[PDB]
Known about the structure:
Chains A, B: One of its GO terms (biological process) is negative regulation of telomere maintenance via telomere lengthening. Chains A, B: This is Telomeric repeat-binding factor 1. Chains A, B: It comes from Homo sapiens (Human). Chains A, B: It is found in: Nucleus; Cytoplasm, Cytoskeleton, Spindle; Chromosome, Telomere. Chains A, B: Residues 1-195 are annotated as: TRFH mediates dimerization. Two copies of one chain form a homodimer. By secondary structure, the first copy, chain A, is mostly helical. The first copy, chain A, has one domain: Serine Threonine Protein Phosphatase 5, Tetratricopeptide repeat. Chain A has helices spanning 3-31, 34-49, 56-72, 84-92, 101-120, 124-134, 137-146, 153-157, 160-178, 182-193. In chain A, α1 runs antiparallel to α2 and α4 (84-92) runs antiparallel to α5. The longest helix of chain A is centred in the N-terminal third of the chain and has 29 residues, at 3-31. Chain A is elongated and about 70 Å long. The relative contact order of chain A is 0.11. At the A-B interface, α1, α2 and α10 of A face α1, α2 and α10 of B. The complex binds (2S)-2-phenylpropane-1-sulfonamide (2 copies).
Amino acid sequence: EDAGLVAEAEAVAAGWMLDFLCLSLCRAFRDGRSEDFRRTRNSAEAIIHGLSSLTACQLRTIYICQFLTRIAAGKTQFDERITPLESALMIWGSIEKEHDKLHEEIQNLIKIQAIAVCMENGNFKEAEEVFERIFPFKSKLLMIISQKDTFHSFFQHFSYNHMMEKIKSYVNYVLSEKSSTFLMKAAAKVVESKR
Amino acid sequence: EDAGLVAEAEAVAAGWMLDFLCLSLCRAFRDGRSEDFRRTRNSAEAIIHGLSSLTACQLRTIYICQFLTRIAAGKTQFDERITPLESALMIWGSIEKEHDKLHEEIQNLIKIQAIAVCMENGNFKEAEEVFERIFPFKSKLLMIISQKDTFHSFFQHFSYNHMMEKIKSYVNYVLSEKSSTFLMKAAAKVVESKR
Ligand SMILES: C[C@H](CS(N)(=O)=O)c1ccccc1
Ligand SMILES: C[C@H](CS(N)(=O)=O)c1ccccc1
């Protein structure tokens, strides 16, 4: 038995498990299956520790998982001194991906929702701190926060539901790109055989 | 897309991941790769949460993982009010497996080592508490503990190294039984293709 070839087979299998768990995390996010998302996220986190070197595609995969993790924790010790949605904005702006119309829409929706979720939770001091970290339009947005005007028409256009719908659209592309991964494809074949 | 068939494919893949991680946990235990064992154990724990119903063979797999986890923590919040080696003894005596000569050897070696590791660590009050929970031979073993006679010939026959050698022998059988699991076999094929 060669220790080096065994380690290589374990690295190949870790790569396969990573893709499968990203696919599962995406479907759970899309479906709103919170507990399933939590478990899959925990598994992806554990599996990602088994890898010490990542390819360009594997880095894209783990960063999509981290982005979705922060988006799901948006309204929830987290060392970072910023909110989950601000942390999602940093991951989003650094992922190796096209900066198309959809990228800017999600970016601006997360920017507004990082402030709005603090107002929804009644923490208006925090909402101002988030605004200062991210940002004529600024003066109007600052006036809104100051007057606890949570349901202003601006917030109804840049809503939480709109942020989630735009991100779910991106998830569907990722779900389609990885729908052909080895582990999921093999498992599906076994299920159809039964059946 | 049928939610039920996707959930089924995820259950098939969880089963495959469980077998692969047990195989990896066994090799890490056999090789003495502590940090690798810790990571694999963490991954098996996370993955096992993705399963809510287990077959007879899957139950055997997770219990072997739990047994090896307690053996590896033998000399280390753990709610249980017993030591890791006493907890390994409970898992060992309840696993669905043959009670052959090797089973009794490992059982008796763990029984003696649950006491001896407390003496090695200088906690002789705990060594007596372990002895009382597990157990003419008893009176002689109690006299040994009472006199802090850690290096008595009895302990050199029922040593830690002997306990580990007997368990590693069992691990090799499990490693051979699961060496043909789908995930590991597929990964090995890919590695050979490269080579
Ligand atoms: C705790 C995880 C680690 S991992 N390896 O990406 O699973 C995480 C890190 C950074 C942002 C979100 C989430
Ligand atoms: C924490 C793990 C849980 S699991 N699901 O078996 O990984 C464990 C439980 C019992 C004994 C040893 C270890």
